[PDB]
């Protein structure tokens, strides 16, 4: 009675992993809401996070190729103390280091004197030198081009023809499971590739409430990503009127360094309010209690030691990589100012062999910045769920980008299908 009828253009899809376009090529966005659908999402199996990670690494590596190498500056340094007025907390933090640098001429050196942060130098004992640059015994140092900025620029990931991106609009979406309010887009919204290690800055806020996302909430080896519904503002500054000088080290190689600091030296601090931070932590704890016992005491603590790039909270305020100390922020059991250390020679992500030198920017650097999320890690159930301790632990950078790509899934369109009809060909 019934016959096979072939249809082409069937609105069905399968989960798939394909290559996405990076648009910024400004797209004309479209969004089609899908009525009466349910789609299973899994933010921790989303290939878009791995592809975004690879794209950011490739763009970063490409940006540093046509730039000045600092190979001739891997020389011994004669470092002494800074003669300006400093406080007790900054004793030994900044050093005045002299060295012999090359010039455009191959057989004519030049004495130089430059201020360096203590974190950027390592002791090395010789008759006339005291320190060397931290990375010169591990890898070449490449100077970032001063014409190229670091500041995140929102980008869009776009599926190729034959593929589509599904967006989950459900409130209180925990990152996995079914989603009912699902729409189809060709390109994602503008996602800022913001680089941070403990707090998520300039990201997306939750529509309804604080959302706690974990691949396995009972596995203490996985990170917990907390998205806030309200932002908490961070005011960061390096209160030092830095005077930047430069020297020519090769035929086309110009090197930039700290020349001097005008006036007294004061430390580099980020201010977060106390009323809103206390409300934020109360909300986070209230949401945590829904994944643990209702009478379990939840306490926050300082991060563990080891690997300064992880133990501190990074930004890219101005053009200078801060590294703040959240120990005074999470020291509570359920304003505020954070001493931030400055480095210039940065090994970003967890790579070894590619060292980038961030040149200083003249003047003061002050930036205000929305905190939109947190990365928390649990210490472990050593008390049998009597008391739980959470720390602002670090993790791979994928966790920050996943915190934006959790709403998107890539699906492959399958235009063909078959179905019974009474239609017989002849």
Partner 1 sequence: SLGFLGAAGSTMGAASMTLTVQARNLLSGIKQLQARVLAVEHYLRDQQLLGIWGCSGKLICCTNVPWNSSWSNRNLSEIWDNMTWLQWDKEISNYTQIIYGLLEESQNQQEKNEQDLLALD
Ligand X SMILES: *[C@@H]1O[C@H](CO)[C@@H](O[C@@H]2O[C@H](CO)[C@@H](O)[C@H](O)[C@H]2NC(C)=O)[C@H](O)[C@H]1NC(C)=O
Ligand Y SMILES: *[C@@H]1O[C@H](CO)[C@@H](O)[C@H](O)[C@H]1NC(C)=O
Ligand Z SMILES: *[C@@H]1O[C@H](CO)[C@@H](O[C@@H]2O[C@H](CO)[C@@H](O[C@@H]3O[C@H](CO)[C@@H](O)[C@H](O)[C@@H]3O)[C@H](O)[C@H]2NC(C)=O)[C@H](O)[C@H]1NC(C)=O
What track of x and - describes contact with partner 1 for positions 273 through 302 (by CB under 8 A)? ------------------------------
Structure token digits, residue 220: 């203490």
Q: What is the dihedral of CA 199, 368, 154, 358, to 10 degrees?
A: -80
Interface with ligand Y, residue 184, by CB under 6 A: no
Q: How many residues bind ligand Y (CB under 6 A)?
A: 58
Of 90, 145, 147, 80, which Cα lies nearest the Cα of 114? 80
Give me the residues paired with residue 141 across strands: 355
Among 74, 308, 368, 416, binds its own copies (CB under 8 A): 74
Burial (CB count within 10 angstroms: exposed 0-12, middle 13-18, buried 19+), residue 57: middle
What track of x and - describes contact with its own copies for positions 92 through 131 (by CB under 8 A)? --------x---xxxxx-----------------------
Interface with ligand Y, residue 235, by CB under 6 A: yes
Interface with ligand X, residue 129, by CB under 6 A: yes
Residue nearer to its own copies on the CB measure, 254 or 367: 254
Q: Is 410 helix (H, G, I), strand (E, B) or coil?
A: strand
> Which of the choices partner 1, its own copies, ligand X, none does residue 13 contact, using the CB cut-off of 5 to 8 A by kind?
partner 1
The number of residues in the chain equals 426
Residue nearer to ligand X on the CB measure, 99 or 322: 99
Among 43, 141, 225, 298, binds its own copies (CB under 8 A): 141
For 9, left (φ over 0), alpha (ψ -120 to 50), or beta?
Answer: left
Q: Is 110 helix (H, G, I), strand (E, B) or coil?
A: strand
Report the distance separating Cα 170 and Cα 172, nearest Å.
6
Residue nearer to its own copies on the CB measure, 12 or 74: 74
Report the distance separating Cα 303 and Cα 375, nearest Å.
11
Structure token digits, residue 92: 């030994």
The least distance separating ligand Y from the CB of residue 344, rounded to whole angstroms, comes to: 14
Interface with ligand X, residue 113, by CB under 6 A: yes
Among 7, 91, 351, 385, binds partner 1 (CB under 8 A): 7
Report the distance separating Cα 194 and Cα 388, nearest Å.
30
Among 25, 108, 128, 219, binds ligand X (CB under 6 A): 128
DSSP string, 255-278: EEEEEEEES----EEEEE-SHHHH
Residue nearer to ligand Y on the CB measure, 286 or 351: 286
Among 27, 29, 72, 363, binds its own copies (CB under 8 A): 72
Report the distance separating Cα 413 and Cα 235, nearest Å.
46
Q: Which residues contact 124 (CB under 8 A, 6 or more apart)?
A: 76, 130, 131, 132
The least distance separating partner 1 from the CB of residue 349, rounded to whole angstroms, comes to: 20
Report the distance separating Cα 267 and Cα 314, nearest Å.
16
Q: How many residues bind partner 1 (CB under 8 A)?
A: 44
Longest pairwise C-alpha distance within the chain: 99
Interface with ligand Y, residue 347, by CB under 6 A: no
Interface with ligand X, residue 30, by CB under 6 A: no
Run of H or E residues at 61: helix 47-63
Handedness of CA 144, 146, 151, 153 (dihedral sign): negative
Structure token digits, residue 328: 């005074």
Among 5, 230, 267, 389, binds ligand Y (CB under 6 A): 230
> Which of the choices its own copies, ligand X, ligand Z, none does residue 202 contact, using the CB cut-off of 5 to 8 A by kind?
ligand Z
Structure token digits, residue 218: 């009972």
The least distance separating partner 1 from the CB of residue 13, rounded to whole angstroms, comes to: 8
Q: Judged by CB under 6 A, which stretch of 18-26, 80-88, 193-201, 272-280 contacts ligand X?
A: 80-88
**Which parts of this chain interact with partner 1 (CB under 8 A)?**
1-13, 18-21, 30, 32-37, 160-164, 184, 413-426
**Which parts of this chain interact with its own copies (CB under 8 A)?**
71-72, 74-76, 100, 104-108, 132, 135-141, 248, 250-252, 353
**Which parts of this chain interact with ligand X (CB under 6 A)?**
76-78, 82-84, 96, 98-100, 111, 113, 122, 128-129, 137-138, 260
């Amino acid at each position: 009675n019934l016959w096979v009828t072939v249809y082409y253009g069937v609105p069905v899809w399968k989960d798939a992993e394909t290559t996405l376009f990076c648009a910024s090529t400004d797209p004309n966005p479209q969004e089609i809401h899908l009525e009466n659908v349910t789609e299973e999402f899994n933010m921790w199996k989303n290939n878009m996070v791995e592809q975004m990670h690879e794209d950011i690494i490739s763009l970063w590596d490409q940006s540093l190729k046509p730039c000045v190498k600092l190979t001739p500056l891997c020389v011994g340094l004669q470092c002494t103390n800074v003669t300006n007025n400093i406080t007790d907390d900054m004793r030994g933090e900044l050093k005045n280091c002299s060295f012999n640098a090359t010039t455009e001429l191959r057989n004519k050196r030049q004495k130089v004197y430059s201020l360096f942060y203590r974190l950027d130098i390592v002791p090395m004992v010789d008759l006339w030198t005291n320190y060397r640059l931290i990375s010169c015994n591990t890898s070449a140092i490449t100077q970032a081009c001063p014409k190229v900025s670091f500041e995140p620029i929102p980008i869009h990931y776009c599926a190729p023809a034959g593929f589509a991106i599904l967006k989950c609009k459900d409130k209180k979406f925990n990152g996995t499971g079914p989603c009912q309010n699902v729409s189809t887009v060709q390109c994602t919204h503008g996602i800022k590739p913001v680089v941070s290690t403990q707090l998520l800055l300039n990201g997306s806020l939750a529509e309804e409430e604080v959302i706690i996302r974990s691949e396995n909430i009972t596995n203490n080896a996985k990170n917990i990503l907390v998205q806030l519904n309200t932002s908490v503002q961070i005011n960061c500054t390096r209160p030092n009127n830095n005077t930047v000088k430069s020297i020519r080290i090769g035929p086309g190689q110009a090197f930039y360094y700290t020349g001097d600091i005008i006036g007294d030296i004061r430390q580099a601090h980020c201010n977060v309010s106390k009323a809103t931070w206390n409300e934020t932590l109360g909300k986070v704890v209230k949401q945590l209690r829904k994944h643990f016992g209702n009478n379990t005491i939840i306490r926050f603590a300082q991060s563990s030691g080891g690997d300064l790039e992880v133990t501190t909270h990074s930004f890219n305020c101005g053009g200078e990589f801060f590294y703040c100390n959240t120990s005074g922020l999470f020291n509570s059991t359920w304003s505020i100012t954070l001493p931030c250390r400055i480095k210039q020679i940065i090994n970003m992500w967890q790579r070894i062999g590619q060292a980038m030198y961030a040149p200083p920017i003249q003047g003061v650097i002050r930036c205000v910045s929305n905190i939109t999320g947190l990365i928390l890690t649990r210490d472990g159930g050593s008390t049998n769920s009597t008391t739980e301790t959470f720390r602002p632990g670090g993790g791979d950078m994928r966790d920050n980008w996943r915190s934006e790509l959790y709403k998107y899934k890539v699906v492959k369109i399958e235009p063909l299908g078959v179905a019974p009809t009474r239609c017989k060909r002849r």
